[PDB]
C-alpha cells in the first residue's frame, strides 16, 4: 500500500466534446484511502509559494500548461483544503483580518497568532520556539531555502525572533528593534540570529546584509559574512560551488548566498498598466538572461538540500519558498508571477519524486497569505492594472491586479489553499487554521514541546 | 450573455 | 463506520495563546477514512452559492461568526477540492478563461464545455441531456430550487436548451434564440422548456416571465402561468400555499413562484463607496424586513423539497441555489453579499442533517465563480469602493470590490472550492474540472 501522487489530471481529451474536459478517469475513493496514513513522518518538506494560491495557480496553468493542463507537481497532491490566516491586533488582542507575511510566517512556524510585522514572537513580544529549532532539539537535520532574501519574512521566521520583520541586521535592528539589538542584551538582528540558529542547510538570496559589521558581541567589527566563516559555515555563492558540496551538518553547516537581494526571476515581461489589456498588446514572457547555469534554480537548491539532509538517519525538516519576486520592479508583473509558480512546480516535483520513493515523507504545499491577482474577461472592463497574455492554448488571458502602480500589490484576508502528501497529510484537508499546520508538522514528526 | 450582457436591449 | 460531518472547527481556545487558534483538536486520518465510501448513492443534493468563492466564505465567517468562527454547514464538509471552470470560444473552440453562469451551469449539468451565454448546448448549438433529465429517465424524483429567477442560468441549465441565457420567455426567444422559438419549430423559450421538463419540485422567483403568453403551440394565446395550470401543475405563491402541499410527482408536479424577480435578500446595508472605509461610519448589517413569514427562505424550500422528493423509493436529485442577489441594486453590496452566504449555510445544514441520518445521500456544495470582492486592511491604499463592517469579534473588517460602481461586479477565472459529503464525495477532492461534477453525479446515482 504505497501512497499515490496524481499521475495525470489534465483534460483527458477533446474539450469541445462531451467529457473531453474531464480530469478524472474513474472513481477516486480507492485513490484517497490509499493516500491516508497516520504512520509517523520521518521527514517533512514544506513548500511555500507566494502565489501558490488558487488564482495564481490557475493563471500559471492556463499560461504554461493551457486551461486543460496539469502541473505534475502542484496539482499532483491528493489531499487539499483551505486555511485561515488572520492576525491579531497587538493592542486589543482582537483579530486583524489581513495578515502580512511575518504574522503569517510566525503562525505556521510556531503555532501562535501574532501582530503584523512580528517575527517569531507573540503580541507580548515574547519569543516562541519555531518548528526548525524544535526539529533541531530532536536531532533532525534542518533546511531553510528561499529565492528571496534569507532575511525576508519567510525563511526568517524559522530562525529569528524580532519585534519587527524590518530588523535585517545591526543598524536597522538597533533603530527599529532596540530590545532585540545585540548591544542591548538581545539575541540580535535577523541575520545574526539566523547564524545562531545554525541550520544544516540555508540556501537563498540577501548577501547584502551579510556585508554589515556587528556593533557588539564576540564578533564585533567583522562582517556577518566573516562571522559566518569564523563560525564554521561552508560559504557557497553559485551553482558550481553548491554542487561541489558533499556534506552539511552541525560541524560543517552550509550557507548559500546566491544573490545580493532576491534571487533572479525566471521570466521577464512588462508591468501591468491601467487598461493594458486593450491599451497594450498581448504579452508572451521571455527567458530572463540573468538566469544561467551559475545560479541554482529553486528546484536544484531543493534537490541538493534533500540530498544533504537525507543523510541524517533520524530524519529532516526542510522548508522551501519560491518568492524570487520583489516589490515594485518585478511588481504588478504577470510573467514574474507565473514564472515563480513554474519554478515552484519543479521544486515540488523534486520534493514529491523523493517522498514517493522514501515513503515516510510528508510534503505540504501552501501559499503565503492572499493577494489581489485575478483572471478577468478579455474585453474592455479591467480595471486596475491589467495585461493580456498569449497562452499555451494559443488564446489570450487577461489579468488584473487592483492595487496601484506606484504601490505594491495588496494583501487580502481570503482563506488559502493548502495540500499535502504522505503520512498525516489528512490534517490539512477541509477547513483549518494556519497555526494548525504547526501542530500538524510537530505531531507528524513526533517532536516534543 | 447576461452577466450582465452588453446589448440585451432595445 | 457512519460518515461524519465536521462538528466544530472554530478556533478552539484563546487566539492570543499558543495553539489557541487551532481548529483541529487532534489527528484527522481516521475521520477521513470514515468519510470515504464507494457505496451507491440513492440521492444527491447539489447546493450552489452564487459567486461564493473562498473570499466570500471567509468574509461571511469573519463577519457573522468571527475570524475563528465556524459554519456548521459550509465549513462542515470533510472532503474538499478545487475545480476549473473555463469556457470555450464559440468560433475557435479554444478556452476562454473567464466563464459566465450559463456555460458554468451547462458544464456541471451536461458535462460539456460551451460558450459564455449558452444553456444546455455545446458550441455547435447542439443539445445535450442534463443530469436532471437523466434522473427522470431513471425514475428518480427531481427538484430544482433557487432564490433567483427560475429562468436564470443555474436552475434553467437543468431544464432548458437555448443558444442564449437571455431567452427567458416567448418575446425574448423570438428575437435572440430564433431557432429555439416555438413558432419556428424550436423547443421554445427557457420557461416553456421548464414546463416541458416537468421536474417534480420547482421553487423560486421568476414569476414575471410567466405573465407572458405563448405565441404558438397547444397553449398559444394564454399566459405561461395559465399553461402550467392547464398541464396539472400545483401553482404555489407563498409560504402558506407551499406548506399545504402534501405531495409532488409527475401527475401533480409542484411549481412555486415566490417573487416577480429574485427572492428577497436576507440582509440590508449601504453600498461600498470610494473611500467608504474611512469617510463613512463602520457598518452593521440590518435584517431585510421584506423577509416575510409568507415568503419561504432558501432553507425552508430545501426542507420542503426534501420532504416531497424523499417519498420516492428509487431516490432523487435536487439542486438548491442561493443567489437572491441581483445586479446592481443589491450589487457591490457587502451586507447583501454576506447575508447571502448565511442563507446558503442554513440550507446546507438542512441538507447535511438529512443526508447524515439517511446515509445514502451525496451532498455537494460549491460556487460557480469567485467574485473579485476582497477583504483588505483597514488602512487599504488601493483604488476602489470600500466599506468597513463591525464583525462578531468586536473589530472592524474592510471590504473592497474592483468593479466600477455603475458596473456590475466582474467574473474571474480562478479555480474554486467544491466540497462533498457522503457516498462518492471523494471525487471532488484534489483538482477536478467543473464537467467532472456531471460525471461524478452521474456515476454516484448510476445513471445511463
From Swiss-Prot, chain A:
The EC designation for this entry is 3.1.3.1
Q: Which GO terms describe its biological process?
A: protein dephosphorylation
Any idea which UniProt keywords this protein has? Disulfide bond, Hydrolase, Magnesium, Metal-binding, Periplasm, Phosphoprotein, Signal, Zinc
What is the gene name? phoA
Q: Which residues bind Mg(2+)?
A: 50, 152, 154, 321
- Catalytic reaction(s) noted: a phosphate monoester + H2O = an alcohol + phosphate
The protein's assembly and partners? Isozymes 1 and 3 are a dimer of identical chains, isozyme 2 is a dimer of heterogeneous chains, one of each of the subunits from isozymes 1 and 3.
SUPFAM superfamilies in the record? Alkaline phosphatase-like
Q: Which InterPro entries match?
A: Alkaline_phosphatase, Alkaline_phosphatase_AS, Alkaline_phosphatase_core_sf
How is this protein named in the record? Alkaline phosphatase
Q: Recorded GO terms, molecular function?
A: alkaline phosphatase activity; hydrogenase (acceptor) activity; magnesium ion binding; oxidoreductase activity, acting on phosphorus or arsenic in donors; phosphoprotein phosphatase activity; zinc ion binding
Q: Which GO terms describe its cellular component?
A: outer membrane-bounded periplasmic space; periplasmic space
Q: Which residues form the active site?
A: 101
Taken from the UniProt record, the cysteine pairs bridged by disulfide bonds within this chain are 167-177, 285-335
- A Pfam family matched in the record: Alk_phosphatase
Domain of life where this protein originates: Bacteria
Q: Where in the cell is it found?
A: Periplasm
Q: Which residues bind Zn(2+) 2?
A: 50, 368-369
Q: What is the organism lineage in this UniProt record? A: Bacteria, Pseudomonadati, Pseudomonadota, Gammaproteobacteria, Enterobacterales
Amino acid at each position: 500500500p504505497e501512497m499515490p501522487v496524481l499521475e495525470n489530471r489534465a483534460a483527458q481529451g477533446d474539450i469541445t466534446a462531451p467529457g473531453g474536459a474531464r480530469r478524472l478517469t474513474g472513481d477516486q475513493t480507492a485513490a484517497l484511502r490509499d493516500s491516508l496514513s497516520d504512520k509517523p513522518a520521518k521527514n517533512i518538506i514544506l513548500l511555500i509559494g507566494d502565489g501558490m494560491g488558487d488564482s495564481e495557480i490557475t493563471a500559471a496553468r492556463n499560461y504554461a500548461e493551457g486551461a486543460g493542463g496539469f502541473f505534475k507537481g502542484i496539482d499532483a497532491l491528493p489531499l487539499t483544503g483551505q486555511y485561515t490566516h488572520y492576525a491579531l491586533n497587538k493592542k486589543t488582542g482582537k483579530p486583524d483580518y489581513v495578515t502580512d507575511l511575518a504574522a503569517s510566517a510566525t503562525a505556521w512556524s510556531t503555532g501562535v497568532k501574532t501582530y503584523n510585522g512580528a517575527l517569531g514572537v507573540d503580541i507580548h513580544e515574547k519569543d516562541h520556539p519555531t518548528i526548525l529549532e524544535m526539529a533541531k532539539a530532536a536531532g533532525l537535520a534542518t533546511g531553510n531555502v528561499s529565492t528571496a532574501e534569507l532575511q525576508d519574512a519567510t525563511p526568517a521566521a524559522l530562525v529569528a525572533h524580532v519585534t519587527s520583520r524590518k530588523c535585517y541586521g545591526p543598524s536597522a535592528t538597533s533603530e527599529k528593534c532596540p530590545g532585540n539589538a545585540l548591544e542591548k542584551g538581545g539575541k540580535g538582528s535577523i541575520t545574526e540570529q539566523l547564524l545562531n540558529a545554525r541550520a544544516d542547510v540555508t540556501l537563498g538570496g540577501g548577501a547584502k546584509t551579510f556585508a554589515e559589521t556587528a556593533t557588539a558581541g564576540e564578533w564585533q567589527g567583522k562582517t556577518l559574512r566573516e562571522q559566518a566563516q569564523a563560525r564554521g559555515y561552508q560559504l557557497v555563492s553559485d551553482a558550481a560551488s553548491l554542487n561541489s558540496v558533499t556534506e552539511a551538518n552541525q560541524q560543517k553547516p552550509l550557507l548559500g548566498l546566491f544573490a545580493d537581494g532576491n534571487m533572479p526571476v525566471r521570466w521577464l515581461g512588462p508591468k501591468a498598466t491601467y487598461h493594458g489589456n486593450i491599451d497594450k498588446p498581448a504579452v508572451t514572457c521571455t527567458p530572463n538572461p540573468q538566469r544561467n547555469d551559475s545560479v541554482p534554480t529553486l528546484a536544484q537548491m531543493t534537490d541538493k538540500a534533500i540530498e544533504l539532509l537525507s543523510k541524517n538517519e533520524k530524519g529532516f525538516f526542510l522548508q522551501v519558498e519560491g518568492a524570487s519576486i520583489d516589490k515594485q520592479d518585478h511588481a504588478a508583473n504577470p510573467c514574474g508571477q507565473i514564472g515563480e509558480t513554474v519554478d515552484l512546480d519543479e521544486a515540488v516535483q523534486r520534493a514529491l519524486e523523493f517522498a514517493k520513493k522514501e515513503g515516510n515523507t510528508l510534503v505540504i504545499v501552501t501559499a503565503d497569505h492572499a493577494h489581489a491577482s485575478q483572471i478577468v474577461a478579455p474585453d474592455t472592463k479591467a480595471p486596475g492594472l491589467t495585461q493580456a497574455l498569449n497562452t499555451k492554448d494559443g488564446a489570450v488571458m487577461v489579468m488584473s491586479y487592483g492595487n496601484s502602480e506606484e504601490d505594491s500589490q495588496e494583501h487580502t484576508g481570503s482563506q488559502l489553499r493548502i495540500a499535502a502528501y504522505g503520512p498525516h497529510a489528512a490534517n490539512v484537508v477541509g477547513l483549518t487554521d494556519q497555526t494548525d499546520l504547526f501542530y500538524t508538522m510537530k505531531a507528524a514528526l513526533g517532536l516534543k514541546h | 450573455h447576461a452577466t450582465p450582457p452588453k446589448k440585451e436591449a432595445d
